[PDB]
Amino acid sequence: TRLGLEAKKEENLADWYSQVITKSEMIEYHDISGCYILRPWAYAIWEAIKDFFDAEIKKLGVENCYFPMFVSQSALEKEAPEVAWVTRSGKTELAEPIAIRPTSETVMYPAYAKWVQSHRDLPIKLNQWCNVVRWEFKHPQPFLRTREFLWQEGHSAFATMEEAAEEVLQILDLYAQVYEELLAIPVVKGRKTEKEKFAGGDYTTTIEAFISASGRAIQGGTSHHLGQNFSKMFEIVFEDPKIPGEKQFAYQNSWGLTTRTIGVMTMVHGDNMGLVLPPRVACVQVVIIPCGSEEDKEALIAKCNDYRRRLLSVNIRVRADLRDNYSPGWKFNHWELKGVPIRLEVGPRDMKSCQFVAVRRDTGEKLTVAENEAETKLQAILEDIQVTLFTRASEDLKTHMVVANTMEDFQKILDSGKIVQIPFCGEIDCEDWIKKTTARSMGAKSLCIPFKPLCELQPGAKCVCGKNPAKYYTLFGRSY
Ligand SMILES: O=C(NC1Cc2ccccc2C1)c1nccnc1NC(=O)N1CCCCC1
Ligand code: PRO
Ligand SMILES: [Cl-]
Ligand SMILES: [Zn+2]
């Protein structure tokens, strides 16, 4: 066991990630491959995301619920290799296997069919916070790629396509708000290609995040328009209020956001000193550490409690580390590893001078702040830390996302650690050829068709394959 980190983020990113998530007390490993323990330091971030997102969807009329985890084989057949099957209880074998949900479309929609008789029963907007299981045999990674993960999943059903199309973008923007405003992570809004869209849906919208350390992208969240494909599978129908006799199928959406958010936060903002928490999601925004007798020792404790109560009065999540068995230097390293945005340091000389040293986690700057200006200055520093983290991550993404129009430039830019927007024909066969040619997975797959591309096509613009014309500028790159 060692004091600080041992692996540089730019040297061994895998070892760096494992050291950051464990020494920040976020992740503990489990004896089942692909499953990881969420320690309170990690789970508190998820609770911050949950508190924000849950209040926002309720403002939109979505209500919470809980559907069973187990799916009958019959329900799944209405619509495979990553689904986990329960086959016995104790020593007795079940009559037939039952599946653990990888997603709850086939669980809820049989119930949706019973609840919809007329168009007045629509819309139905439900969300549940729960766990799903996707038992893939690919290489797992904590937070990012796990066999079990926590998420929310929203499932809406409307009578018109126009209501559904509007919610898809509304939910997607809330997902962007979670990454941009809470996690200080920039994302690219876009549409998945036909190959990468949700199976059984019409179109899939997504937010793509970029990990600069690896040059790989990852899907931060998704919002599907299922159209009428699932309402035809489960007979979610209603009598047409404008045409008697004929029946209509409901238009549906589904949208999900997982704990992968936390791992992206770690990969983007974490440095060689450990984790870095955005002040918006840090359960401890300011940690007070006494610095520099037995009565003078009690003096530092009283002043640390005074700053603690004053910060609580201005709604600043503050905690004081008054433990007598750890030296100040140890606490400096400890709370630096955990990513607390501000380390409030109070010593004997600073206290007698009505001062204290505030250390920004993002930049390491030591700011000497007077006692009278404690509430206002610490709020300004917290605000500037959130802005700085987002601005640096934003310009990092902008400089690593460029445009290429030939496979030669595509490959050269891809090898420099960037993601590229290329003229793409949209076909699945060409997308497979792009991944195979760029692999020589090390190959590039499609990320999204950007809502706002960097440039536009022109009449006669050919795809990178050269055989089909280009339909849209599409973002490609190596992915998680
Ligand atoms: O897809 C995940 N895991 C599977 C891929 C993989 C790779 C290696 C080993 C096992 C597995 C299972 C995932 N894992 C953790 C957290 N979020 C995850 N998913 C998502 O964030 N998205 C976007 C939102 C809708 C759902 C999909
Ligand atoms: O798994 C998915 O991608 C969608 C979104 C949450 C529910 N089903
Ligand atoms: Cl919960
Ligand atoms: Zn093509």
Swiss-Prot record:
TM ranges are none
Q: At which positions is L-proline bound? A: 103-105, 134, 224
- As stated in the Swiss-Prot or TrEMBL entry, residues carrying the post-translational modification Phosphoserine are 327
Annotated binding of ATP, by residue: 134, 136, 145-146, 219, 222, 258, 260
Region named Proline--tRNA ligase: 1-480
- Variant or mutagenesis effect after changing residue 134 to L: Almost complete loss of prolyl-tRNA ligase activity
Binding of Mg(2+), residues: 219
Q: Which residues carry this modification: N6-acetyllysine?
A: 471
Q: Where in the cell is it found?
A: Cytoplasm, Cytosol; Membrane
Q: Please give the subunit comment from the record.
A: Homodimer. Part of the aminoacyl-tRNA synthetase multienzyme complex, also know as multisynthetase complex (MSC), that is composed of the tRNA ligases for Arg (RARS1), Asp (DARS1), Gln (QARS1), Ile (IARS1), Leu (LARS1), Lys (KARS1), Met (MARS1) the bifunctional ligase for Glu and Pro (EPRS1) and the auxiliary subunits AIMP1/p43, AIMP2/p38 and EEF1E1/p18. Forms a linear complex that contains MARS1, EEF1E1, EPRS1 and AIMP2 that is at the core of the multisubunit complex. Interacts with TARS3. Interacts with DUS2L. Component of the GAIT complex which is composed of EPRS1, RPL13A and GAPDH.
Q: Which family does it belong to?
A: In the N-terminal section; belongs to the class-I aminoacyl-tRNA synthetase family. Glutamate--tRNA ligase type 2 subfamily. In the C-terminal section; belongs to the class-II aminoacyl-tRNA synthetase family.
Q: What does this protein do?
A: Multifunctional protein which primarily functions within the aminoacyl-tRNA synthetase multienzyme complex, also known as multisynthetase complex. Within the complex it catalyzes the attachment of both L-glutamate and L-proline to their cognate tRNAs in a two-step reaction where the amino acid is first activated by ATP to form a covalent intermediate with AMP. Subsequently, the activated amino acid is transferred to the acceptor end of the cognate tRNA to form L-glutamyl-tRNA(Glu) and L-prolyl-tRNA(Pro).
Q: What name does the UniProt record give this protein?
A: Bifunctional glutamate/proline--tRNA ligase
